[model samples]
Target chain A: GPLGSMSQSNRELVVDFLSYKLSQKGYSWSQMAAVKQALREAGDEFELRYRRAFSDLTSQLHITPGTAYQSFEQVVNELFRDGVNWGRIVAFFSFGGALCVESVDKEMQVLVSRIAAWMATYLNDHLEPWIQENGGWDTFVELYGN
Target chain B: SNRELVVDFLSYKLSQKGYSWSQMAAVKQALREAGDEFELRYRRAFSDLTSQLHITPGTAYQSFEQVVNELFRDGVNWGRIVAFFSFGGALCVESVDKEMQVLVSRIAAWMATYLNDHLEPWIQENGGWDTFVELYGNNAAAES
Candidate 1:
């Protein structure tokens, strides 16, 4: 899929979504340090819960042999099923960031863009409406601050 | 300590702060390849810290203030305060002009005072600066 399909508008929505979700849990997302910590914790949880899968995916350049998108899709499906909570959302992005890092390191440019596009689309299609209903992106930004 | 050790420590710190393993590995590799050239290696390491802080040529001072203030506001512990000052010290050395040198020094002083007053006991309970060096330093050493 073309990268533009995700749109900058949707990107901001997901950021807002993550920001709002964090705020409701008594965690502020205004600072990069705090956000980074949250992302690190998210990655930790995902790694622990899916140790074998995490190891396999992270070590390899391409997701080949095993389904690459399965873990990503499974996590998103689970998040939606589990009520789209803060932890799950963070886990999704953290996982994505981790994979993105690995792909870049391994010089797998194709895999990098694939995961990036997948994440942006997932946020737009699945999480955007919920973010809108809760109070829209603007409200989220307002509550969470920059 | 060797430049490699410093890179390793920064890599670990950045990893804990949400930088991916691969990203930090790249930083380590870059510094290692910069070899024995002090200026080149130091510049690479300095840029790595600024990258983590999202500091750029245009936003250097402002970004430094914001990130250090965040460290202060979050009640960061002694070890992290040390890391902040260590980074600021490097920034001071690498800085070209008066503004950046002064800014980095100001940050170092804040973290220093913060360490002496509030975080002294915290550092002791955690086995002091030696323990910190051993912990992160060894982690970096083993990984490298």
Candidate 2:
């Protein structure tokens, strides 16, 4: 499915967040790629690490076109509401989320993809609100050429 | 830190009769002098090292460094905290023509694992101080 306007911003957020997580966890950047690869082998890397964080957000989605967006919004609202060190932590969660997106077992794939679509939708509606409140991200670079 | 140091004796075979004992010692001593102060262990000069081992000179230096590092430091690296070995191979003082290649390759593998295990913590500590403690300390009683 095509990504909504907020999808790009959220995707970038994921990368930065996971990078920060690795550093805090005392893993060198070179190890991050290997860690992700290993985690992927064991199955849904994100759902394994931060299930509690995403559980409530994805649970709210009830088979809608924009449920994926809604799920994304719910997570963004919850995680980025405060201006904490979200950048680093998000990297870990982003990787996990990416694993969730790439689920191979048919059951997991449908469940996660459905959840993902809402996440995308949610971000579209709340991207500006997040940027303004969060303060760290540059909206100009996020939306326009930079 | 000022304690008298004891080191394991290691010698490499080079193409049967390729070099003299003095030449080998010169290369070994070169590595010994240029050693890392952080670990109190020296670096390996691959050209010098391989010349003694009778292996080709253009080999990777990292492999050589690993052998010297492990032989000088505590056994474990970061990955294997205890750095225990699962298998044992017999050490034949007298060299065998067939076993030479196998021995050299295995030694390289052993040292690579050793280096990664030993070098990583040192890197994390930004030096080898923690490594020294971790190496010297024993969780099971002070002295055994």
Candidate 3:
């Protein structure tokens, strides 16, 4: 599905999560001129780098309907304890994607939107600076995309 | 780095062409209403995210850059791009509402810089503002 060098399902997972969020705003997920494609490339590259670890991390996550944010925060907080780099940021987002798909599969569909909100909050609070320091999305495309 | 000056220069250039102040008011009103709509559509996430940001007088400009960069981190489109400008307007509004008049022009300048440098190239490739006006400007100023 991606023109870049990443797995289809992983890219779709990011797509699914984004589309879910965008749809909440009455927007549809469509290809754009530059940024979206580059984003997919980063998603793909992140997956390629940590396919097993990412999958294993998702499979082991113990999130449920309510009270999920603290659990997510605790675990994700651990995941970011080592540091926040571009890789970890991508992983953090992928982790959210993983949690969403599994939540749907386990019939906890209500958690998806909450999960999206929580992720948005965390991103706004935490990752914004590291992203800014690293030259923004354009930099992410330049360094991560193959 | 002063991407905002493109608009500034436009204003200057347009003034030389004998642009009238009343017409500028109409354009301002239109952009303001559209920004209001973007605020309406995006306010849910916008409110939540802005709530958590460490917006302060000391570091407000940096905070704007940090948050706005992430907006298009995953992807961007016309709506999202407009949301960026709308985002700055909201920031300006809040800062002014807080009586932080000191931050207003600085925030405005920062936004213009981001627009000119980071976003302008992508815009040009996407057929420029005329295409954007063709798309969103033609929406007839009515909404559900």
Candidate 4:
């Protein structure tokens, strides 16, 4: 669990602790490194997790985030933006209600928003104790160990 | 502000390295291959480090040349591979010589079929590369 309270001072303390942890070297490989290195590793983890997160959340919620993210025509238009006519590939993703290849380029923004939305939905689905105790992103990190 | 700094540095530092266009093309092809392998991860990291690393096709060529030379027994013909690419590009990219594009396309199609016939299916079934010649690789020369 994270140290300190949910307020500004508490958050600042946690940030400082995390920053310190980021700078410290590991005893073994992957022990952690410079602040920038830590952030890079974190970002890499975040990227993979977001994809899995999307898959898991969608499966649980059954909301079709990829489908609602963009329409078939828009997805197709974007997929062929560079004049690539991967017609078979387009049909594969579209029929399954998933984003097209072109839309994958637009994934960062679309996925982040959906993740935040899922957090809200998840909070609503459960009780206040979970929200207050877990505190969204931090709680997510703690549980998933991201 | 970030974009401004980036543009400023790029404008000042993007001077020609005087390597032949063929060499540049080879390096760019390698970069694209790496980009596809790692998808966007390596691509973004590559661009970010490109300034600091001072990388060029010469560097890639040298590295891979050493690897191929030291590791492989079938004396690596870096020159021949490069010459083939140079000739291929010359035919493909010459806009004024309009028929060259058609010729290049035909060459690629023929090469692809020949390669596919000798390589792809073998790779698909073998589940991995064999001792250099099971597919139309270095060993294909001996068979045909």
Candidate 5:
């Protein structure tokens, strides 16, 4: 919604807006390669804290491209079913990035874009209302940026 | 990295044949007198801290200073104060190890000034390291 170009949907913008410079939280690409490694600490810290719950999903999924998002969506829905606060939202993106990494690791590089699209879709469809209600990414940046 | 880090450092060093608590005051005073001296010693001395803190050097210097301020934000105890020293030492070692040797003395001076000006009063009021050791010293079991 903030991009103001080509009248792209909010979903498309989400695909562009998840990560920021040296700070975590945003969608990314080759830029993600830099941010991904940069984000290891957040991912590591968040995963360590949320491991058991996170693993419940990891353990259950077969993780193929076809199965990539079906299980991904369900597991995410299950994870956030009870509630969706900022922490959960960050974890949601972390999980998406994790799945993308895993896809490439498994020689399913073909699915990376699809995986990201799925994340953007989920963010726009399920998480956008909450994000907008909470004053958007600018709020997140101000709240946590270095 | 709280007091346990200090405890660990203390246990390792104090058990090295002999040491003293009177020197806590004396050494901290010396720390102030030659803060650069200690940082010089610290920068030259490494092979330990760098192996862990490598999220990046971007997190060095000011970032650590801010974290230390935040750690001491709530309050202070001998443990936290010692942890401050440990925190400083960790940065000193990591800074040198990363080859950004420029910060070693800067960090040392800041730590010394903070300790001498800000933390010393608390230590004196709390009965110095005597009280600290009784409560959290190596023989911590002896306290209760």
Candidate 6:
């Protein structure tokens, strides 16, 4: 069996995306302030968790040739393993987008986009039902916008 | 005036640390992907920035500040901004500098603010950022 559970890894990426967003947005101070107020504790576990998943996927990807799409299938399946959920799907895309941007600078454009495209396609197909039910992403943003 | 001084000090500090090979590699790669024209412009801007700012230590800050101001003034976009941060992050990783940390954090803060205020709403309308939050926001609440 795989060393890491697929569902857990996908969940970790969601946390990673949030952490990345917060850090990139300079909301760390707010996060930290909340911590001071004992509203919520903060830590770097997300980064470590994300790195583990990254390492696992990258390593799994390199061990063979056709593993590219295989890895994609695995990740997508893991993300929606239980059922379709818009929030978790968005997490996968957010993290994927971040990874794509990061990879552009790092020169991993092709490989990273391959994974990103698969996630996009998966979301378009598997998550469309839930997305349409919720008034698509636009309405969701309007309702959730702050 | 205060903003100019701040910008100059930060750019000066960055030039002092310079960039590592890996950092340069990524910047160059990203620029190349942006196409030959963008690569040329960024390369030229980067070179001019390094040369113009390399005077006597404290004196360099003023020059550095001016060049950086030009980048923003000339409408340097998010890609180039990422390049700057990528190189800055590389410098910090290769050799830790307290000032570098501060400078990078400042730049990160600026970019973050820019993205949220300028690009985020655009992305939402364009159907990306909104898509991200829609999926995760409720999922996050439910999970917790």
Which candidate tops TM-score?
A: 3
Candidate 3 chain A least-lDDT 10 residues: A5-14
TM-scores, all candidates, are 0.34, 0.24, 0.38, 0.21, 0.36, 0.30
Worst 10 residues of 4 chain A by lDDT: A24-33
* Residue lDDT tens for model 4, A1-146: 13322233222222222222222312111122132233233433444454343233223323334544334234333333454322322221222222211223343324333433332332244223443554532343334332
Evaluate candidate 1 and give its CAPRI docking class based on DockQ: incorrect
Chain A TM-score for candidate 3 is 0.68
Counted clashes in each candidate structure: 0, 27, 1, 0, 5, 4
Q: What is the C-alpha RMSD of each candidate to the true structure, in Å?
A: 16.6, 22.1, 20.9, 23.4, 21.0, 20.3
Q: How would the candidate models be sorted by TM-score, starting from the highest? A: 3, 5, 1, 6, 2, 4
* lDDT for each residue of candidate 5 in B1-144, tens digit (9 for 90 to 100): 112222222222222323321234233322222333333455345343334445253554545455566657788865456455555555555555566655555655555556655676787688854565454444534656
What TM-score results for chain B in every one of the models? 0.37, 0.25, 0.69, 0.26, 0.53, 0.29
Q: Candidate 5 regions off by >4 Å?
A: A1-41, A52-54, B1-144
What are the chain A TM-scores of the candidates, in order? 0.48, 0.31, 0.68, 0.24, 0.63, 0.46
Model 1 chain A scores worst on lDDT over the 10 consecutive residues at: A9-18
lDDT of 6: 0.38
- Tens-place lDDT per residue, model 2, A1-146, is 14442333222222222322333333322333333323232223334565556545434333333334444444556555564343423332353244343332222434443433433444345443553576423322222211
Measured with C-alpha atoms, the lDDT of residue B73 in candidate 2 is 55
Regions of candidate 3 where Cα sits further than 4 Å from its true position: A1-33, B1-144
State the lDDT of candidate 3 residue by residue for A69-120, as single tens digits.
6677767776678888877876776666556656666778676566666676
Candidate 5 lDDT, A68-112, residue by residue in tens: 556668878876888877667667666655555566567776665
Question: Which has the better TM-score: candidate 4, or candidate 5?
Answer: 5
Candidate 3 pairs with clashing backbones = B4-B112
- lDDT of candidates 1 onward, in order: 0.46, 0.33, 0.55, 0.29, 0.49, 0.38
* Poorest lDDT segment (10 consecutive residues) of candidate 2 chain B: B1-10
Docking outcome class, model 3: incorrect
Computed on C-alpha atoms, the DockQ of candidate 4 is: 0.01
